[PDB]
Each structure stands twice: as structure tokens, then as C-alpha cells.
Amino acid sequence: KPGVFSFLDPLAYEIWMCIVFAYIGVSVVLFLVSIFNSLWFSLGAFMQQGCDISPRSLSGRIVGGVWWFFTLIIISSYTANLA
């Protein structure tokens, strides 16, 4: 039995570093619409579907849609891989 690593196996570590950096990049963009606050809101975005509270489009809400599409694709690919 692998420890920890087995979960990590389906998707490469590099890909993880990439999704992390990419998410961090997405995170700040919401703040641009407005170091802690909206970054925390993005933390409230990845957690659930993607983004909220945008007064109809504005700017970053479409970022939320793209991000939703994004995380959707990745998790799908992951599950397929483990399968």
C-alpha cells in the first residue's frame, strides 16, 4: 500500500503545481473587479461552483463561469483517469 502518493498518482505533481498557480492567478482577478479580501472571496469561489455576488456580469463573473468550466473539466479528467 502506497501512503498519500497513491491518491496523488492519477494526476502528475506538475499538473498540481499548475492548477494551484492558475487558481492563484484567477483569485486576484476578482479583486480587480473590486492581498486578503477578494482573495478570500475566491477562496469562497473554488469551494463552490465558482464565484458569486457579482452585480450581473460586471467583469469577474464571466471569469467565474470560465473557472467553473475549468474545474469541471479537470475533475472530470481526474475521475476518468482514476477509473
Binding site: 498557480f21 492567478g25 479583486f31 473590486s34 492581498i35 477578494s38
Partner: peptide, 17 residues
């Protein structure tokens, strides 16, 4: 350097807020 630009953008956003 990427996260340098990132933290730069974050703190400067904290400044524009």
C-alpha cells in the same frame, strides 16, 4: 518571479481598494 508579480498585484490591489 511569477508569484512576485502576483503578490505585487495583490498588495497593490489592496492599495487601490
Amino acid at each position: 518571479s511569477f508569484t512576485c508579480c502576483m503578490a505585487a498585484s495583490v498588495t497593490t490591489l489592496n492599495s487601490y481598494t
